[PDB]
Paper text:
SAP05 is an effector from a plant pathogenic phytoplasma that mediates the degradation of host transcription factors, including SPL and GATA family proteins, by hijacking the 26 S plant ubiquitin receptor RPN10 independently of substrate ubiquitination. Specifically, SAP05 folds into a tight globular structure consisting of a parallel five-stranded β-sheet (β1-β5). Although SAP05 carries a single domain, it utilizes two opposing surfaces (hereafter referred to as Lobe1 and Lobe2) to interact simultaneously with TFs and AtRPN10, forming a dumbbell-shaped structure, in which TFs and AtRPN10 have no direct surface contacts. In summary, SAP05 bridges the TFs mainly through electrostatic interactions with a hydrophobic core, whereas the SAP05-AtRPN10 interface comprises predominantly extensive hydrophobic contacts.
In the SAP05-GATA18 binary complex, the ZnF of GATA18 has a type IV zinc finger motif containing a single zinc CysX2CysX18CysX2Cys zinc finger, in which the zinc ion is chelated by four cysteine residues (Cys154, Cys157, Cys176 and Cys179) located on the α-helix and the extended loop. This zinc finger motif is evolutionarily conserved from plants to animals. Upon inspection of the complex structures, we found that the Lobe1 of SAP05 creates an acidic surface that interacts with the complementary basic surface of TFs. For instance, in the SAP05-GATA18 structure, the guanidine group of Arg188 from GATA18 forms a bidentate salt bridge with the carboxyl group of Asp106 from SAP05. Simultaneously, the Lys185 of GATA18 is salt-bridged to the negatively charged Asp106 and Glu107 of SAP05. Furthermore, Arg182 of GATA18 forms another bidentate salt bridge with Asp108 of SAP05. Apart from electrostatic interactions, the α-helix of GATA18 is further stabilized through hydrophobic interaction between Ile181 of GATA18 and Ile84-Trp85 of SAP05. At the edge of the α-helix of GATA18, the side-chain carboxamide of Asn177 is coordinated by two hydrogen bonds with the carboxyl group of Asp66 and the backbone carbonyl of Phe81 from SAP05. In the SAP05-GATA18 interface, three pairs of salt-bridge interactions stabilize this binary complex, whereas a single alanine mutation of the negatively charged residue (Asp106, Glu107 or Asp108) in SAP05 or the positively charged residue (Arg182, Lys185 or Arg188) in GATA18 diminished the binding affinity by 3- to 40-fold. Through sequence alignment and structural analysis of AtGATA and leafhopper vector MqGATA (Macrosteles quadrilineatus), we found that the three positively charged residues Arg182, Lys185 and Arg188 in AtGATA, which form multiple salt bridges with SAP05, are not conserved in MqGATA.
Residue numbers in the entry:
A (entry chain A): 152 to 189
B (entry chain C): 37 to 135
C (entry chain B): 33 to 135
D (entry chain D): 152 to 187
Write the structure that this text describes.
């Protein structure tokens, strides 16, 4: 598995993203969730 | 030592890997990241936001509860001590040195 | 109306405000808040200023939770918002108050 | 006035507590009502 945003192979948790479930690393998935706050 | 009701807990470790044995710090620390991070909320491995201009040997900052503004390279350690926003403990993780 | 979630007979109402000060003027719900507390709270029963119990691990912008009916477990730092949605215990509406985050 | 338990001076309602009338802030007095 690889992060759609940062291309990392190493994360403690694969997270939801624009490209699908489990598509972002833990850091990018948390940034994404922050971005989607309204 | 205390900001309002929040206690400031400095903990010094033998190495960053030692934090893996610590409950509940081990479920909030993201060990794959470069540079010390803080959490803006309670979530799995939530310590991901970059602390600004971090002092040497700082490993991370964990707020035990509540939420705060979550941005990269915006808040210094000293700013973060004022941003508990209801957390009862702010844990500040340090790598020991021998000087 | 159509996008609103339900849990059993209970409807989940997410109402958004500019700030907690706006809620002070919101009848008939302001009377249940305790505006001196830090961090979002939920009520264990119906009574004035009843929303004092601290929600655990809250998400950003959550300002409080008001169950309009019945009673439930009343503890600090024990129940997350998701647990609370299963704790209506007969309430017909769960009002969840949010602070607007400017995009 | 100050809450005998948490020491706040701000509360929407002073409540009775084991130490005396109106000695608890709103939250502390609701917690006290809960624990008998
Ligand atoms: Zn990523
Ligand atoms: Zn009190």
């Amino acid at each position: 598995r690889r992060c759609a945003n940062c291309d990392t192979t190493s994360t403690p948790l694969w997270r939801n993203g624009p490209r699908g479930p489990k598509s972002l690393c833990n850091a990018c998935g948390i940034r994404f969730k922050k971005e989607e706050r309204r | 030592e205390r900001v309002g009701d929040m206690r400031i807990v400095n903990i010094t470790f033998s190495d960053i890997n030692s934090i893996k044995n610590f409950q509940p710090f081990s479920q909030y620390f993201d060990f794959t990241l470069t540079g010390p991070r803080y959490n803006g909320n309670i979530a799995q491995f939530a310590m991901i936001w970059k602390i600004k201009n971090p002092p040497h040997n700082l490993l991370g900052v964990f707020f035990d509860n509540n939420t705060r503004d979550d941005e990269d390279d915006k808040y210094t350690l000293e700013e973060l001590k004022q941003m508990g926003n209801g957390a009862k403990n702010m844990y500040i993780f340090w790598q020991y040195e021998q000087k």
